[model samples]
Target: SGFRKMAFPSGKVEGCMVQVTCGTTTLNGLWLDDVVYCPRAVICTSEDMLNPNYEDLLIRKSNHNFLVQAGNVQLRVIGHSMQNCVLKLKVDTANPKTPKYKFVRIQPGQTFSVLACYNGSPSGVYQCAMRPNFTIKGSFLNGSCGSVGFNIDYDCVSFCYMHHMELPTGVHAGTDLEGNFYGPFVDRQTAQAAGTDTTITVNVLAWLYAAVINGDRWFLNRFTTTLNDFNLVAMKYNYEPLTQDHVDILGPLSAQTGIAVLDMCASLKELLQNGMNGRTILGSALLEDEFTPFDVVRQCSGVTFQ
Candidate 1:
């Protein structure tokens, strides 16, 4: 269900993943290139996470791999990533030319594992490669536009393919091969600096704000649930209701906001509740029935949760 790639405020990047959402905690992960990301963990297949009762699989790893038992599939991570360099594994003599490929990234000392059928014995090559430097990080904004556009950042990278991303050098707006609009975009200079490996030269591909974006209710329902869950935590600890305020907190939490915070209104909360979300303060462009959640996005700092 986490098929939706999401970005977070901190850990420095746009187009990342919510990765593993254990309980109420949503772990941040990268969405491989179109939005390439490092795999923090092989993780439990959502199917297994859904059915914990199915058990008895001792998941382990030898230098190069692990077991694949059925029902309770085994798991393993064979290699590790360099400090900042990347490596990948693409296997399947057992299932080669499978029409699809999945790459795994383990930290300096991390291990990745898998799941097999409860009683069935699984066999195959968990193959491997060197992940391309085809990744970028950046975000867009809606500033000074008469009727500001609200925007959201998504990592639906797995849902994406390697794109001919057009990274910008300054504040620009538009789309690349990717239809996921970008803008009030992230500057190429900053984006490239973040992962400066001379091995590859790619743009800081921007994600501009849009008024009407698409979503999958299949996973959107999960958003409904998280909104409820995260808000409860919000109510219990932060003493606030579910609204744009909580989302504003994420980007600033992104840590870079200390500076970006200046472009924001005095209080991001006030902006959402009033300022940018401020009708009296803003103009009529917002009144168009066309207005969507993205408006609130342009109105706030930003966790685009859906």
Candidate 2:
């Protein structure tokens, strides 16, 4: 298959893009935090039967085990040790693993953060089995570090950024109204570093925007007045349709056999049919949510999704 250069012109800030798949029925959706759909993105191999779990997947090598999640805010590999140890993490990369990650020390109860984002920049996400390729060095502290345990918690209701114009007038704020927080995050390190066991609550102005994006009828019904008031203002500037600017980044399927391979979306049949083993999820703004409803009877369920 050929490649599709995914573009999102409306966005003043360029962010990372991801591909997702659920069998042959795959499409692309441009978003900020993460993507949840694409072409054959699911791993249905008998060995790697794909399923989304709630926690990070465990990648283990005999004794030492690590918590790994590929699709997230970053290509994160976590180290948790029971005893004291100096652990090094190596990620096999397509490039010279930019930032050449270093080793971090972990103690009985300490969690070490080994990320390229230490200075907060872009390091392409390592999705799928590529994350588990991580190998740990040094010794184990507590419990037997067995095969990596995992959870499919990353692909949440991927926060969307409604791109219309440039984002900021002054220096960047923590998060713009649309939830695309690509800017530098200030040191709330003190707040986050309180202790290992801690929970924080935030009092934000309008976090409920997710409900509207998700079109949760339950929330909308409960807050009819709220939705109406929101519509009064949002409808005025709420139009960011998809064009060729937003397509799925693709790769060749020559190596991947067994799965039916072909041009998914568009085609002009050639005289030499052998050239048809192509694929694409191009120019798509495919939303994961099924449908939109106007009234109670016409609920989210009423929309016959593809």
lDDT for model 2, please.
Answer: 0.19
- Model 1 residue 66 lDDT score: 24
Provide TM-scores for the models. 0.18, 0.15
Candidate 2 — worst ten consecutive residues by lDDT sum?
A: 198-207
How far does residue 141 in candidate 2 sit from its true spot (Å)?
A: 15
Error of 1 at 56 (Å): 33
Give me the candidate number with maximum lDDT: 1
- For 1-306, candidate 1 gives per-residue lDDT tens digits of 111122222221121221212223222222222222221122233443333321121123222432221123222333323111111222121211112223222211111111111112121111111112223222222111100111113521112211112344422222221222222222121342122212110000001111111221110111123445444443433222434442454343323223122122112222223323323212232211121222223444444334
Model 2 clashing-pair count: 18
Per-model RMSD to reference: 21.0, 23.6
